[PDB]
Enzyme design. Structure first.
Site, PDB file in Angstrom:
ATOM      1  CD  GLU A  34      68.630   7.535  -6.020  1.00 16.95           C
ATOM      2  OE1 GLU A  34      68.282   8.195  -4.951  1.00 16.95           O
ATOM      3  OE2 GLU A  34      69.865   7.284  -6.127  1.00 16.95           O
ATOM      4  NE  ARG A  96      69.955   8.328  -1.291  1.00 15.56           N
ATOM      5  CZ  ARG A  96      70.752   8.192  -2.163  1.00 15.56           C
ATOM      6  NH1 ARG A  96      70.598   8.617  -3.377  1.00 15.56           N
ATOM      7  NH2 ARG A  96      72.144   7.915  -1.740  1.00 15.56           N
TER       8      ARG A  96
HETATM    9  N1  LIG Z   1      67.839  14.890  -4.866  1.00 16.83           N
HETATM   10  C1  LIG Z   1      69.096  14.500  -4.806  1.00 16.83           C
HETATM   11  N2  LIG Z   1      70.158  15.510  -5.167  1.00 16.83           N
HETATM   12  C2  LIG Z   1      71.613  15.321  -5.107  1.00 16.83           C
HETATM   13  N3  LIG Z   1      71.859  13.844  -5.432  1.00 16.83           N
HETATM   14  C3  LIG Z   1      70.881  13.146  -5.442  1.00 16.83           C
HETATM   15  C4  LIG Z   1      69.726  13.139  -5.129  1.00 16.83           C
HETATM   16  N4  LIG Z   1      69.134  12.134  -5.270  1.00 16.83           N
HETATM   17  C5  LIG Z   1      70.028  11.047  -5.511  1.00 16.83           C
HETATM   18  N5  LIG Z   1      71.206  11.723  -5.538  1.00 16.83           N
HETATM   19  C6  LIG Z   1      72.492  11.066  -5.911  1.00 16.83           C
HETATM   20  C7  LIG Z   1      72.958  11.214  -7.104  1.00 16.83           C
HETATM   21  C8  LIG Z   1      73.726  10.136  -7.320  1.00 16.83           C
HETATM   22  O1  LIG Z   1      75.090  10.559  -6.986  1.00 16.83           O
HETATM   23  C9  LIG Z   1      73.471   9.099  -6.401  1.00 16.83           C
HETATM   24  C10 LIG Z   1      72.841   7.753  -7.174  1.00 16.83           C
HETATM   25  O2  LIG Z   1      72.086   7.035  -6.318  1.00 16.83           O
HETATM   26  O3  LIG Z   1      72.374   9.627  -5.535  1.00 16.83           O
HETATM   27 MG   LIG Z   2      71.367   2.870  -6.085  1.00 15.67          MG
END
Ligand SMILES: Nc1ncnc2c1ncn2[C@@H]1C[C@@H](O)[C@H](CO)O1
Ligand SMILES: [Mg+2]
Ligand SMILES: Nc1ncnc2c1ncn2[C@@H]1O[C@H](COP(=O)(O)OP(=O)(O)O)[C@@H](O)[C@H]1O
Ligand SMILES: Nc1ncnc2c1ncn2[C@@H]1O[C@H](COP(=O)(O)OP(=O)(O)O)[C@@H](O)[C@H]1O
Ligand SMILES: Nc1ncnc2c1ncn2[C@@H]1C[C@@H](O)[C@H](CO)O1
Ligand SMILES: [Mg+2]
Lengths: 228, 228
Positions: A34, A96
């Site tokens: 990610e 994710r």
């Molecule tokens: N789509 C998303 N919206 C809000 N937070 C997200 C999203 N995708 C991943 N995260 C969170 C942002 C960060 O705090 C964490 C790092 O992997 O994931």
């Molecule tokens: Mg991570």
């Protein structure tokens, strides 16, 4: 051909930690992290859109949702051409997915009034269309759910030490926890993607120290993968 | 195969008016209106995202730019499958383009501080990628520029009578005018799309009453099209 697995979990459950164990286990196994590093310095200095969302979520949640999902899709699309195109038993792991972006994160933020009806409508429209184009291509064969209590995750935020995440309250983590349990444990969450109802899921309790749990988890992943 | 022409012009220059003359001139000629009606009631009641942008442009410009461009692309992509697939000399006319969305509207709004660096970076990234995917497909064979003074356009806003546009000041219209002159008259505007430098352009002065000018304009369009 290429089996596609997403790794799902709350903030700091231990996905990057888990993912850094995967490639070591087979040369046929690849990974798509990610792009959280991109979100803290937006490039084509830079905007820290991660920070902006957390500091003013009712201003920046839509903009973030738009950029985060997009950057994930591109990273994943980029992986469909790689050493895998020539591997014997290729398995691509996604940290994710487009489904968590929408059904966990964007949904929680709308429900919290961090996005209004207009933002939510535009975002879902955008997300429906993005997926209609890059559909069959990113479809999952399996989900691995890394289950940790929101209180364990709150502690791990502190351990990891990203400045932008340090103000995240347990309450936000708890909302995201119950969303994950709904989707992946109880399987009560309904989506616009019907095949997901069928998708096999492996749930791994990762509340205990990674070092002790490492080997059992690895057994469960190799078993789970062999059954797809 | 299918010649693709965009019709470019300032707000209320007279594009919908012009476009409603095109189909009558040949059964092989089709048209893709700009979905402004969708923008006033956002659907998957509804948000009037057109109104929101004009009322609070430094809050809503990015969200609008995202939705407007997207909705245009889909409308245009939708037209590539139609009666045209069987016409002898098919000509598809686009009301504005992905290039005006970016180089006229989004650019003017960034320059005005209605979008910040972060928004502008995300939007251009998004726009680069959107176009890289749906590239050759939407490329233009020709532009028709409907040239009217910003003062003529201000008057036509009043004639047309969209509630959301009634507060638009001449100053905003003037900025958009000089952008159009730069791109399409003087051809000094540089874009990330090099073929556009070469694209033939027909400039039509539409300051005078449409009814009197109708026939000369039609001659110029039929001539211009025959030379592509
Ligand atoms: N789509 C998303 N919206 C809000 N937070 C997200 C999203 N995708 C991943 N995260 C969170 C942002 C960060 O705090 C964490 C790092 O992997 O994931
Ligand atoms: Mg991570
Ligand atoms: N099972 C575990 N035991 C001890 N620490 C863990 C475990 N899983 C993750 N960590 C640590 O917790 C923090 C968050 O982990 P990380 O892998 O970055 O989570 P995620 O990628 O899910 O956000 C990091 O400091 C990491 O070292
Ligand atoms: N050449 C013209 N002469 C008189 N009225 C015009 C002319 N062109 C457009 N109009 C009118 O001005 C208003 C704006 O025109 P419209 O075609 O909606 O512009 P656009 O589609 O470019 O925003 C409408 O009321 C239309 O009737
Ligand atoms: N991309 C755009 N950004 C801001 N305004 C736009 C854009 N595309 C079209 N318009 C304006 C909005 C509305 O005033 C007018 C209707 O054709 O066009
Ligand atoms: Mg129009």
């Amino acid at each position: 051909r290429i089996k596609k697995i997403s790794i799902e979990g709350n903030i700091a459950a231990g996905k990057s930690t888990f993912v850094n164990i995967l490639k070591q286990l087979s040369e046929d196994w690849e990974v798509v992290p990610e792009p959280v590093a991109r979100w803290s310095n937006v490039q084509s200095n830079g905007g820290n859109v991660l920070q902006m969302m957390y500091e003013k979520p009712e201003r920046w949640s839509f903009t973030f949702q738009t950029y985060a999902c997009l950057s994930r899709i591109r990273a994943q699309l980029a992986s469909l051409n790689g050493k895998l195109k020539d591997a014997e038993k290729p398995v691509l792991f996604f940290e994710r997915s487009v489904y968590s972006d929408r059904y966990i994160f964007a949904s929680n933020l709308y429900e919290s009034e961090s996005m209004n009806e207009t933002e939510w409508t535009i975002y879902q429209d955008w997300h429906d269309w993005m997926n209609n184009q890059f559909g069959q291509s990113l479809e999952l064969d399996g989900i691995i759910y890394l289950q940790a209590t929101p209180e364990t995750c709150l502690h791990r935020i502190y351990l990891r030490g990203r400045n932008e995440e340090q103000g995240i309250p347990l309450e936000y983590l708890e909302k995201l926890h119950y969303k994950h349990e709904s989707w992946l444990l109880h399987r009560t969450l309904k989506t616009n993607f019907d095949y997901l109802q069928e998708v096999p899921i492996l749930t791994l309790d990762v509340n205990e120290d990674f070092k002790d749990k490492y080997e059992s988890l690895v057994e469960k992943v190799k078993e789970f993968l062999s059954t797809l």
